[PDB]
Design a protein around this ligand. Structure first.
Ligand SMILES: Nc1ccn([C@H]2C[C@H](O)[C@@H](COP(=O)(O)OP(=O)(O)OP(=O)(O)O)O2)c(=O)n1
Ligand SMILES: [Ca+2]
Ligand SMILES: [Ca+2]
Length: 344
DNA sequence: GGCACTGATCGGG
DNA sequence: TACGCCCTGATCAGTGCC
């Protein structure tokens, strides 16, 4: 098999640069402003100049402003980044037997048939692809080219930014050995630690250990997954999957336990979640982010689809029950998730 | 026991 | 210290059933 993985570079920030070339060359930070104050929010992405100063995705905006006070801070414009991505996924399309759009800024392409099976052919194709995206969209990207999906992702990651990473079959068995454990996709930094010290810290190490003492450190799924990787017998197909859920989250104007206060926002979230569903969800979940950023959810799945008007009543019921569960913490952000969709 | 179903928590981009 | 929004599947717990 042959896979071309594609990950757009500092994507949201790079798009703001294509849209405003003055931003290029200088610290730039794309921020999610909660609305609560003029700086409440989280960083979504920073360009590499901003990363040089310590700016990190996920970090609170005021934190970012203490270490990079002269960076440009811009509000997120997700619809524009979504467009950019749609357009690029379309370009990748014509180069792929199959394309699995993994997220807003990355995809896997099975090019086995396209390159007439030849590995080097595919490498050249990876090159032509990086050029097309730069020429057409002025976006730079990192690619990986390996016999499977997981490997293409690993060498791409080691090759950011603007990289063209490559693992040939020849060097697959080697790379898998020299492969550290944390460099593996699908293994949390918690799974890391509790595996890290406790015997395993490299990828060939699961090999020497036995499934028992591992099926309880990470579960059967991850255990078998690592096992297969370690012996180079992993090969999942490139398969595009449809979205299964559609959510909306809002920050409350102020922290509260008062359902009468929260309800209008919850309704607004329901309305906007619904407008994203290409169907009728059979399950609605309510998600409350408490004062301390702890996350509570209550959901309900029916035997039939849920109309929007119905969702309001169910959602208010679920939220009201959540607050019974907690009893003392105010809510900070509220969210709703719609899934188990009856597709049109 | 173990199937079939529902429900809550947690991690990645 | 500081704090958004959105999507995933695994896992485990629970319940009713035969
Ligand atoms: N906590 C996060 C992490 C990521 N994203 C969004 C913005 C990112 O730009 C985009 C892609 O995530 P990446 O991990 O690929 O990060 P970048 O593209 O921004 O940088 P790079 O891939 O060059 O390392 O997803 C986000 O909103 N919030
Ligand atoms: Ca990515
Ligand atoms: Ca990226």
């Amino acid at each position: 098999m042959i896979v071309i993985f594609v990950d757009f570079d500092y994507f949201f920030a790079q798009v703001e640069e294509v849209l405003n070339p003055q931003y290029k060359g200088k610290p730039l930070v794309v921020c999610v402003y909660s609305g609560r104050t003029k700086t409440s929010g989280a960083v979504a992405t920073a360009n590499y100049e901003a990363r040089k100063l310590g700016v990190k995705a996920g970090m609170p905006i005021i934190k970012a402003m203490q270490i990079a006070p002269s960076a440009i801070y811009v509000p997120m414009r997700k619809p524009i980044y979504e467009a950019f991505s749609n357009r690029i996924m379309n370009l990748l399309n014509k180069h792929a037997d199959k394309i699995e759009v993994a997220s807003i800024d990355e995809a896997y392409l099975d090019v086995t048939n396209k390159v007439e099976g030849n590995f080097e052919n595919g490498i050249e194709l990876a090159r032509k692809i990086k050029q097309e995206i730069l020429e057409k969209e002025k976006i730079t990207v990192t690619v990986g080219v390996a016999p499977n999906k997981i490997l293409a992702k690993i060498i791409a990651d080691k090759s950011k930014p603007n990289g063209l990473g490559v693992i040939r079959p020849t060097e697959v068995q080697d790379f898998l050995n020299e492969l550290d454990i944390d460099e593996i996709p699908g293994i949390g930094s918690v799974l890391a630690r509790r595996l890290n010290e406790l015997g395993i810290q490299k990828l060939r190490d699961i090999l020497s250990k036995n499934y028992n003492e591992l099926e309880k450190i990470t579960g059967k799924a991850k255990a078998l997954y690592l096992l297969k990787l370690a012996q180079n017998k992993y090969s999942e197909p490139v398969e595009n999957k449809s979205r299964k859920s559609h959510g909306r989250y809002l920050t409350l104007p102020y922290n509260t336990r008062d359902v009468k206060v929260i309800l209008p926002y919850l309704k607004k979230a329901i309305n906007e979640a619904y407008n994203k569903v290409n169907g009728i969800p059979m399950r609605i979940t309510v998600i409350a982010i408490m004062e301390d950023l702890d996350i509570l959810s209550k959901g309900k799945k029916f035997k039939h689809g849920i109309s929007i008007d119905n969702a309001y009543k169910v959602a208010e019921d679920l939220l009201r029950e959540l607050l019974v569960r907690d009893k003392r913490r105010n809510v900070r952000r509220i969210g709703v998730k719609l899934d188990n969709i009856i597709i049109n």
